[PDB]
DNA sequence: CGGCAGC
DNA sequence: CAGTGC
DNA sequence: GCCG
């Protein structure tokens, strides 16, 4: 019953599309209002519906699906029998505004709520009257770019620009696009670049020089999260734009990790997000702990040279990245 | 029922 | 820190 | 929202 234990290709044959589309609207509404645990239950139910092997015929049949309970089976049959979901007609008027505000990179549910209770209703209100962090100011000026997904091929060019720049300093550096790119998706919301060195030595100073190299050449246009540490890993989030006409500003995430942590970092950064949460929860039930750095016990780091070792240690069959798209 | 991933 | 996003 |  664990998502991390099954191939996400089951979702490709979604036999209940018009039901999950309406539930997705409700899930998004609960999210932007900060009710994260109710949102999480809807997300879980929707993946369960997407991978069910047939159309849901009845209340009893919907309840036979792990992740579907009484209240969800009720809504499934309401849609199945009426083509409509009455719950959608009573969503608060604030929700689309809170969604608009939380689409700004750097403004979450609490910031969106604060701006709404100040009377703000549009982006023009935020621009002219809201006090913005430097991050939110960059998220606001690239609002429409950051909402658009990029073709697979553009992410390739972005990773290549980072790779060649990193290898100009040390030709041994290994660079890998992760996230939705490594999962084989046709489009990517951002580019997630994982960097390590197989010599196993610490390379503290290279990252700083890599980032200035990308700024000096005009590729990096803004910082969102400047270089920072996470244990022995280093992380940067920023804004790049490929050269030439008709290019959008794209978000770029770069993590540098010691080789000893490569498999677990690669596993995390490949996702999906719900795959990771499912897998980490499974580890917790087995007295273990899974993070970006390591698989541990309740803490002894267990040796994980490759992703397959994590799957094995958790009793899970291996899944190619494309089968983790939950 | 409290947990719901873990940085 | 919080808030935030990955 | 759902569940061990
Ligand atoms: O909440 C999260 C978000 C991301 N992650 C991991 C998995 C995800 O694949 C990876 C990169 O995060 P992104 O936001 O870039 N998601 P993804 O690349 O899967 O999709 P997109 O095409 O939207 O970038 O970080 C989590 O573990 N938990
Ligand atoms: Mg991504
Ligand atoms: Mg903090
Ligand atoms: Na946001």
Residue numbers in the entry: 238 to 535, 548 to 575
In the authors' words:
DSBs can be repaired through the nonhomologous end-joining pathway (NHEJ), which processes and ligates DNA ends efficiently to prevent or minimize sequence loss. Polymerase λ (Polλ), one of the Family X polymerases, fills sequence gaps of DSB substrates with a strict specificity for a base-paired primer terminus. In addition, we present multiple crystal structures of Polλ in synapsis with varying biologically relevant DSB end configurations, revealing how key structural features and hydrogen bonding networks work in concert to stabilize these tenuous, potentially cytotoxic DNA lesions during NHEJ.
However, the resulting crystals exhibited an entirely unexpected—yet fortuitous—synaptic arrangement (DSB.B) in trans, where the upstream template oligo never annealed. The pre-catalytic complex was trapped by binding of the nonhydrolyzable dUMPNPP. Despite vastly different crystal packing, the DSB.B synaptic complex displays a high degree of global structural comparability to that of the SSB complex (RMSD of 0.53 Å over 281 Cα atoms). Components within the active site (primer terminus and correct base pairs at the 0, −1, and −2) are observed in their expected positions, however, the farther upstream along the DSB.B substrate from the catalytic center, the more this synaptic complex deviates from canonical geometry. The upstream primer progressively diverges from the canonical primer strand trajectory (distances of 1.1 Å, 2.4 Å, and 4.4 Å at nucleotides F3, F2, and F1, respectively). This deviation is likely due to mispairing of the upstream primer strand from the neighboring molecule, which serves as a surrogate for the missing upstream template strand. Interactions downstream of the break site are largely conserved in the DSB.B synapse, similar to those observed in the DSB.A complex. Loop1 adopts a conformation different from either of those observed in the SSB and DSB.A complex (green), which cradles the unconventional DNA substrate configuration upstream of the break site.
